[PDB]
């Protein structure tokens, strides 16, 4: 049983329908570069939509983002024992939780489904249901790559750990010109090609 | 290259809290407030990992206390009702009688309270409807996903009705089988 560990939220420093609303958010962010090689821990605290205090492992101390976090940071940097856990979180929290989950998150591959249909001239290459989001779509008009007339909807998150995108081609098909759409994805061992067959 | 966030929030006076995990924009798991247990976004994830929810609920209690201190230190300054962006999508390209999913995507909003209702021909659909939790953004607003599995029809029209305090009326985004492309 692989186990996820938590980063403990720190206690702060003491100074129905049409009612005021008050929100406090805490985000413990782990940023990864080159796999588990370069790891940056980032303990960030928010009131409403605004950051007030933040721990950066590249800085090594709690610093105030606005004036409201100034009592907290001085309090939190007055306890060196707390700061040692916050600095060691890069190895004990970020890299651990990267480890328990690398199989089904980092190395997750889902096959894209590719469809070519004409719309309201205009051709659409709809690529749906893939993971990760690193996708590359090219339009080959008569065996020639079109760089003039390609508009993409961009990466669209579905929330099912699946992405989708609709790359469009604005051209003028007249008599039996063959059009080809190609998809490059890490879940594919070879590039995927679909022809419109005019 | 990769980003994993432990996302926590608490909202007063609704007294609503949330603890969840995020990998590169997608939810890994969400600790359910009631029933005191983890809910993996994909069921396979629970057969590959595990997490104790009770310490997460302790962190939510710490978030409640920190919200008390921040509310006193802000002279009771309220949150801004940032209105939401609603787009109705389809999981696959629609063909008639070929099963698909209608996705109501809600984006760029705070506070994280929204009333979402699916309407089939103007009638609410309260059963067989899925949803995600309030997923956090990097501008520290919120996004949410709602799913209605359906079977496309020539005559049926659907509506996503999203209610937020940043709006003066409920927002109604329309979808029919014809004119399914509004994405420029």
């Amino acid at each position: 049983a692989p186990k996820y560990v938590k980063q403990n939220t720190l206690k702060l420093a003491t100074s129905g329908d049409t009612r005021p609303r008050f929100l406090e958010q805490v985000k413990h962010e782990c940023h990864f570069f080159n796999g588990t090689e370069r790891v940056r821990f980032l303990d960030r605290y928010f009131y409403h939509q605004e950051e007030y205090v933040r721990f950066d492992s590249d800085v090594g101390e709690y610093r105030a983002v606005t004036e409201l976090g100034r009592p907290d940071a001085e309090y939190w940097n007055s306890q060196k024992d707390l700061l040692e856990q916050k600095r060691a979180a890069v190895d004990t929290y970020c890299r651990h939780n990267y480890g328990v989950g690398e199989s089904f998150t980092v190395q997750r591959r889902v096959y894209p489904e590719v469809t070519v249909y004409p719309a309201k001239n205009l051709l659409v290459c709809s690529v749906n249901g893939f993971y990760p989001g690193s996708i590359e779509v090219r339009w080959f008009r008569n065996g020639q790559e079109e760089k003039t007339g390609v508009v993409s909807t961009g990466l669209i998150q579905n929330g099912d750990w699946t992405f989708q995108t609709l790359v469009m081609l604005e051209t003028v098909p007249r008599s039996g010109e063959v059009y080809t759409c190609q998809v490059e994805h890490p879940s594919l061992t070879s590039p995927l090609t679909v022809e419109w067959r005019a | 290259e990769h980003v994993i966030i432990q996302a926590e929030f608490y909202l007063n006076p609704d007294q609503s809290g949330e603890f969840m995990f995020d990998f590169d924009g997608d939810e890994i798991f969400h600790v359910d407030m009631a029933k005191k247990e983890t809910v993996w976004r994909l069921e396979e994830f629970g057969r590959f990992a595990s997490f104790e929810a009770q310490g997460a609920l302790a962190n939510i209690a710490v978030d409640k206390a920190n919200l008390e201190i921040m509310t006193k230190r802000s002279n009771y300054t309220p949150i801004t009702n940032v209105p939401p962006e609603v787009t109705v999508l389809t999981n696959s390209p629609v063909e008639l009688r070929e099963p698909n999913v209608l996705i109501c995507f809600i984006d760029k909003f705070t506070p994280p309270v929204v009333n979402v209702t699916w309407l089939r021909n103007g009638k609410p659909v309260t059963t067989g409807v899925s949803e995600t939790v309030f997923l956090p953004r990097e501008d520290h607003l919120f996004r949410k996903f709602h799913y209605l599995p359906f079977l496309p029809s020539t005559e049926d029209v659907y509506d996503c009705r999203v209610e937020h305090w940043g709006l003066d009326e409920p927002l109604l985004k329309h979808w029919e089988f014809d004119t399914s492309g509004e994405n420029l």
Partner: antibody, heavy 120, light 108 residues
């Protein structure tokens, strides 16, 4: 490439009608509304009006009788007309973008602006 | 119809300084304030919306908050390219009204 680009005459005689067009790209005029804001040189900014994605049009009370804002979604353009222009209407005119059909949606991505000089 | 009072009218500060522009509202704007930056010969660029939400493409050194009933744009470490005119804008009710503007200049 989200772009908004103003276009128009530049020089209008007094008491005539100024006619400007904002041509947009990168987004849809059926999903986005656009604001018209004018800035006299040296002075501040002044909101002229909005045309939302649903076709709702809102003008300012000071220029209510003189401002007409319309929309051609097919050509991705929005037109602003000022009737009976005076020398106070000489300004740099801007079209900006907002989401949806409500005022509480923030104004994103302004355009570069065109200069209109009212002189005979 | 809603009044936005911007202060100070002009400002000069050194590189690396922390500057603070304040904007008073006559009524309550319910958090719907936008901070805009206009470099000369250019359009206003969206810096902050909803009084503290940072637009994508704005650097981290800009921050928005509320000092009591007044609103606050804060540049943490001032840079030479931040010479501009800054405007506050309410978007809670028609008509949308801007401030007079603050001309931020660089000392050297």
């Amino acid at each position: 490439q989200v772009q908004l680009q103003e276009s128009g005459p530049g020089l209008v005689k007094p008491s005539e009608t100024l006619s400007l067009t904002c041509t947009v790209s990168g987004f849809s005029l059926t999903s986005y509304g656009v604001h018209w804001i004018r800035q006299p040189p040296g002075k501040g900014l002044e909101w002229i009006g909005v045309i939302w994605a649903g076709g709702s049009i809102n003008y300012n009370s000071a220029l209510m009788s003189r401002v007409t804002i319309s929309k051609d979604t097919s050509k991705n353009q929005v037109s602003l007309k000022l009737s009976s222009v005076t020398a106070a209407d000489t300004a740099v005119y801007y079209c900006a973008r907002a989401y949806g059909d409500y005022v509480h949606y923030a104004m994103d991505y302004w355009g570069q602006g065109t200069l209109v000089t009212v002189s005979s | 119809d809603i009044q936005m009072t911007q202060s100070p009218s002009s400002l000069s500060a050194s590189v690396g300084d922390r500057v603070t522009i304040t904007c008073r509202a006559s009524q309550e704007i319910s958090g719907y304030l936008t901070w805009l930056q206009q470099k000369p010969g250019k359009a206003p660029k969206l810096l902050i919306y909803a009084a503290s939400t940072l637009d994508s493409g704005v650097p981290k050194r800009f921050s928005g908050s509320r000092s009591g009933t007044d609103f606050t744009l804060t540049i943490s470490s001032l840079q030479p390219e931040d010479f501009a005119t800054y405007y506050c804008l309410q978007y809670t009710n028609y008509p949308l009204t801007f401030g007079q503007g603050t001309k931020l200049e660089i000392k050297r």
